[PDB]
Amino acid sequence: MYFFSVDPRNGASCCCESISARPGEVNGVMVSYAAWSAPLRGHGLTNKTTFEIDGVSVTPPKVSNAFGRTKVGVVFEGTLSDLFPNPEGEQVEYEISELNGPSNGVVELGANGAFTYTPGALFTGVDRFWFSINGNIGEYVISVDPTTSELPQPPFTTPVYVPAARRSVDPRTHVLKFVLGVSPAAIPGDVYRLTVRQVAIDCDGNEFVHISCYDISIGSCG
Amino acid sequence: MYFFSVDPRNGASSCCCESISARPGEVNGVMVSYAAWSAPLRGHGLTNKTTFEIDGVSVTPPKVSNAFGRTKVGVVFEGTLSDLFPNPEGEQVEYEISELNGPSNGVVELGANGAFTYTPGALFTGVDRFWFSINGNIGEYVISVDPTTSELPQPPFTTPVYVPAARRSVDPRTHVLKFVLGVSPAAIPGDVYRLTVRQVAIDCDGNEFVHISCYDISIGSCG
Amino acid sequence: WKTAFYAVEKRPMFFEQYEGGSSAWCVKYQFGAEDGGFVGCCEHGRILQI
Amino acid sequence: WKTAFYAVEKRPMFFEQYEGGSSAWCVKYQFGAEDGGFVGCCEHGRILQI
Amino acid sequence: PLQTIREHAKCDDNPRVTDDLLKLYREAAFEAAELYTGLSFTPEKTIVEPIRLKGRRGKIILSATPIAGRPVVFYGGGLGSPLELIPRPGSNVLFFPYGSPDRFQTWGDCHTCDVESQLMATYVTGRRCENSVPAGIIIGILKLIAWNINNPGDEVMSVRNTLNANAQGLIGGTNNGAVISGAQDEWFRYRR
């Protein structure tokens, strides 16, 4: 769990703070807005925080991701070779990372870029599994539909993300909490930037904006 | 009984992965204390959704090969031991059946030249293994005794280093993970394997906090 | 209403100290009650809507 | 037998509602007893075998 | 700076233990000073701190003496609405007004047992563009440096504290450093 005490803007190496990250983890972050919100005596903070992620070093992914579809109870099979355009000519050692396998089914990885995904009995939803071709990690998503029409198409989760709704702000002690998850397809050495815009409120119903930045560094093994 | 206090992921305090020393044959226990990481994450403690993986960064592939047989209940089983030691150079074969790693529910007698006989115990059905030692090199010979009805399935030829199927545990009151680590008697001294652990906590509403760490298991003889 | 819906009653509310769980800091009470209801012949009874 | 083997009784069976771990909806009972025995004089008995 | 340390300790054209040992002595003097004093390098002048109620009328001792008159803000600790208080210049002891503005209690709860969120306070101990001065306590550091240059550790040096004796025929003792050199009685000026 990370913890940052923000500057209260009283006129008193980089500017943005440092956050280390490991491919696969999902950690939590706390920010103590007490220094900036307490002098502004009002109704404390409000749940109107906004985040934004940018990448200042990307190293674009070698292997592309992919998506499939199948009905419930029906086994789904597909390929895993047309997703890795290789520039040179070499061999391909496909692998399904056991730590990031499926969650509601099983996958039978054949010898040559082939697999079959049998979903669990009576399961309708989305499922993901992170393959690894020549060390390059990419996710494959499969949606099992309840045989009626279809399910929507998931958004292909980013290398670094903040979940939809897991944030909370305590107006009694001026602390913001949120979750910071790093995809297992993150590439070591890359650096992202998370900008946070937090809004306070006065006694009458006007706003006090406050903006900060953070530098996430994707490092291996800690 | 090893004990590791994992890093707390707070941006504060040679190889990164910790070390674990094991001797071929032993079966030990390990404790991991996620307190420093999961206690500030006020939730429902840990969950039994952990996953382990064993990868080898140095193998030195074995010299002798293993072998699998089949037999029924009460019927004596015979087998040889000479076609399991591919020798590139010419040398004598000092066949040996270690008294420590012998069969569990039967009995074998070693022949003079690559011969042995596994007479299973009366009224016994299942799977029984025993570890031979061809000229210092160690392998295993696995035999399954069938209850004469149809057939038995195939055992998975236990690996040099393994984590047992279901012996893990967790105490959410103190945030401690307990699991077993067993090394096969055929592990070659001097090698090193890598064990990875994925422990997932839980918040108050049922979401997940993932955490990954690694451990270097170096199979060393004589302690 | 006297024939379209019935409300059953078994025991009124109770409040019982919970010795155990009270860890010498946090004295913990416990309360509960039992009741129920069910719809009888739902032909006597109509609903108006926009 | 009145002198070849003695029976020791210290605190025999007792039942009690184990207050603590028992809530306003589930009871947990606990029973127990304490007894023992030893031999008195190897030179007073005998055993017949085949 | 290293050249300033040299010109103070007279090690100038007269080479003493090398620059490696000089920077090591400096690294140790920076763990002796502001560790005997208690101050912290670059501590981000604005300070948040859980302040503890003490007394029936409640003195509040500010651990960083917020400058002179900038209103320190208090919140939490049964206090539903935060409030300002302008402090003492030179001293940091104030009084929490016993007249309470509100008490936002939460009687009855089993997830936190409704004890309390502690009283906390935010202030600044900053200043002007001349925000702070770590000088004044540099002279004791330099004196400690010079003392450790010219006392490598084989010459017997010991000043005496008590007048009569210690117990036995032993040669007294105060042989510590930073006091037989004049650093303690120069750092005591910034010590509470």
The residue type at E119: L
On whether any CB of chain A is under 8 Å from the CB of B65, the answer is: no
- H helical segments located in chain E: 2-8, 19-32, 139-149, 184-187
Count of helices and strands (H, E) across chain B? 1, 17
Resolution limit, Å:
4.5
If DSSP states are collapsed to H, E and C, what string results for chain A? Answer: CEEEECCCCCCCCCCCEEEEECCCCEEEEEEECHHHHCCCCCCCECCCCEEEEEEEECCCCCCCCEEEEEECCCCEEEECCCCCCCCCCCCCCEEECHHHCCCCEEEEECCCCEEEEEECCCCCEEEEEEEEECCEEEEEEEEEECCCCCCCCCCCCCCEECCCCCCEEECCCCEEEEEEEECCCCCCCCEEEEEEEEEEECCCCCEEEEEEEEEEEECCCC
Using CA coordinates, name the residue in chain D closest to C15: D24
The two beta strands, B27-33 and B176-183, are: antiparallel
- For residue E148, give the 3-state DSSP assignment: helix
Lookup: tokens for C7: 């409300």
What distance in Å separates the CA atoms of residue E44 and residue A5, rounded to the nearest whole number? 10
Which has the closest alpha carbon to E78: E51, E59, E45?
E51
The residue type at D6: Y
Written as one string, the DSSP assignment of chain B is -EEEE----SS----SSEEEEE-TT-EEEEEEETHHHHSSS-SS-B-S--EEEEEEEE----SS--EEEEEESS--EEEESSTT---SS-------B-STT--SSS-EEE-SSSEEEE-PPSS--EEEEE-BEETTEE--EEEEEE-SSS---------SEE--SS--EEETTTTEEEEEEEE-TTPPTT-EEEEEEEEEEE-SSS-EEEEEEEEEEEE-S--
Kind and range of the H or E run holding B48: none
Which has the closest alpha carbon to B62: B204, B163, B191, B164?
B191
Residue showing tokens 């003889």: B221
What distance in Å separates the CA atoms of residue A8 and residue A29, rounded to the nearest whole number? 19
On whether any CB of chain E is under 8 Å from the CB of A202, the answer is: no
The residue type at D49: Q
Which has the closest alpha carbon to E46: A43, A175, A33?
A33
Contact A6, A212 (CB under 8 A): yes
Q: Which of E46, E73, E84 sits opposite A12 (nearest CB)?
A: E46
For chain C, state the CA radius of gyration.
20
Contact A185, A130 (CB under 8 A): yes
Closest CA of chain E from A180, distance in Å: 25
Strand arrangement, sheet containing A94-96? A66-71, A136-145, A125-133, A94-96
On whether any CB of chain B is under 8 Å from the CB of A164, the answer is: no
- Tell me whether residue E11 is exposed, middle or buried, using C-beta atoms within 10 angstroms of its C-beta: 0 to 12, 13 to 18, 19 or more: middle
Q: How many Cα atoms within 13 Å fall on the side-chain side of residue B9?
A: 27
Q: How many residues does chain E have?
A: 192
Lookup: tokens for B157: 């030829």
What distance in Å separates the CA atoms of residue B76 and residue B119, rounded to the nearest whole number? 5
Task: Supply the DSSP symbol for E54.
Answer: B
Contact B206, B35 (CB under 8 A): no
The residue type at B61: P
Kind and range of the H or E run holding B58: strand B51-58
- For residue E74, give the 3-state DSSP assignment: strand
Contact A22, A220 (CB under 8 A): yes
- For residue E77, give the 3-state DSSP assignment: coil
Contact B91, B51 (CB under 8 A): no
Lookup: tokens for D29: 């009972």
List CB contacts of B75: < 8 A, sequence separation 6 or more: none
Could you count the other beta carbons within 10 Å of the beta carbon of residue A108? 12
> Residue A159: what are its φ and ψ, rounded to 5°?
-55, -40
Kind and range of the H or E run holding B38: helix B35-38
CA angle C14/C16/C21 to nearest 5° reads: 140
Lookup: tokens for B151: 């057939």
Residues of chain B neighbouring A167 (CB-CB closer than 8 A): none
Burial B143-179 (b: 16+ CB within 10 A, else e): bbbeeeeeebeeeeeeebbbbeeeeeebeeeebbbeb
- For residue E108, give the 3-state DSSP assignment: coil
Contact B78, B114 (CB under 8 A): no
What distance in Å separates the CA atoms of residue A153 and residue B13, rounded to the nearest whole number? 42
Gaps in chain A after residue (C–N beyond 2.5 Å): 12
What distance in Å separates the CA atoms of residue C28 and residue E114, rounded to the nearest whole number? 12
- Tell me whether residue E161 is exposed, middle or buried, using C-beta atoms within 10 angstroms of its C-beta: 0 to 12, 13 to 18, 19 or more: exposed
- For residue C11, give the 3-state DSSP assignment: strand
On whether any CB of chain E is under 8 Å from the CB of C25, the answer is: yes
Lookup: tokens for B154: 């195939």
Using CA coordinates, name the residue in chain C closest to D21: C20
CA angle A198/A199/A205 to nearest 5° reads: 170
Closest CA of chain C from D15, distance in Å: 19
What distance in Å separates the CA atoms of residue A66 and residue A156, rounded to the nearest whole number? 9
- For residue E43, give the 3-state DSSP assignment: coil
What distance in Å separates the CA atoms of residue C20 and residue A22, rounded to the nearest whole number? 43
Could you count the other beta carbons within 10 Å of the beta carbon of residue E144? 26
What distance in Å separates the CA atoms of residue B31 and residue E80, rounded to the nearest whole number? 45
The two beta strands, A76-79 and B208-219, are: unpaired
Lookup: tokens for E144: 């400690």
CA angle E130/E135/E136 to nearest 5° reads: 130
Mutate one of C17, C25, C26 to test the E interface: name it (highest E CB count within 10 A).
C26
What distance in Å separates the CA atoms of residue E5 and residue E143, rounded to the nearest whole number? 9
On whether any CB of chain A is under 8 Å from the CB of B129, the answer is: no
Contact B207 A179 (CB under 8 A): yes
- For residue E22, give the 3-state DSSP assignment: helix
Contact A190, A59 (CB under 8 A): yes
Contact A19 B11 (CB under 8 A): yes
What distance in Å separates the CA atoms of residue A185 and residue A127, rounded to the nearest whole number? 16
The two beta strands, B27-33 and B133-134, are: unpaired
In DSSP terms, A53 is beta-bridged to A194
Contact C28, C22 (CB under 8 A): yes
Q: How many residues does chain A have?
A: 222
In DSSP terms, B177 is beta-bridged to B32, B170
List CB contacts of A98: < 8 A, sequence separation 6 or more: B51, B53
Residues of chain B neighbouring A25 (CB-CB closer than 8 A): 9, 210-212
What distance in Å separates the CA atoms of residue B41 and residue B133, rounded to the nearest whole number? 51
Mutate one of A173, A175, A201, A202 to test the E interface: name it (highest E CB count within 10 A).
A173
- For residue E120, give the 3-state DSSP assignment: strand
The residue type at A44: G
- For residue B101, give the 3-state DSSP assignment: coil
Lookup: tokens for E17: 């233990």
Report the Cα–Cα distance between both ends of chain B, in Å, rounded: 14
Give the method of determination.
cryo-EM
Contact A51, A196 (CB under 8 A): yes
On whether any CB of chain B is under 8 Å from the CB of A109, the answer is: no
Which has the closest alpha carbon to C23: B44, E113, E109, B175?
E113
On whether any CB of chain B is under 8 Å from the CB of A24, the answer is: yes
List CB contacts of A164: < 8 A, sequence separation 6 or more: none
Contact E110 C25 (CB under 8 A): no
What are D's interface residues with C at a Cβ cutoff of 8 A? 19-25
Residues of chain A neighbouring E131 (CB-CB closer than 8 A): 12
For chain A, state the CA radius of gyration.
22
What distance in Å separates the CA atoms of residue B65 and residue B138, rounded to the nearest whole number? 9
Closest CA of chain A from E154, distance in Å: 43
CA angle A189/A61/B214 to nearest 5° reads: 50
Burial D30-44 (b: 16+ CB within 10 A, else e): eeeeeeeeeeeeeee
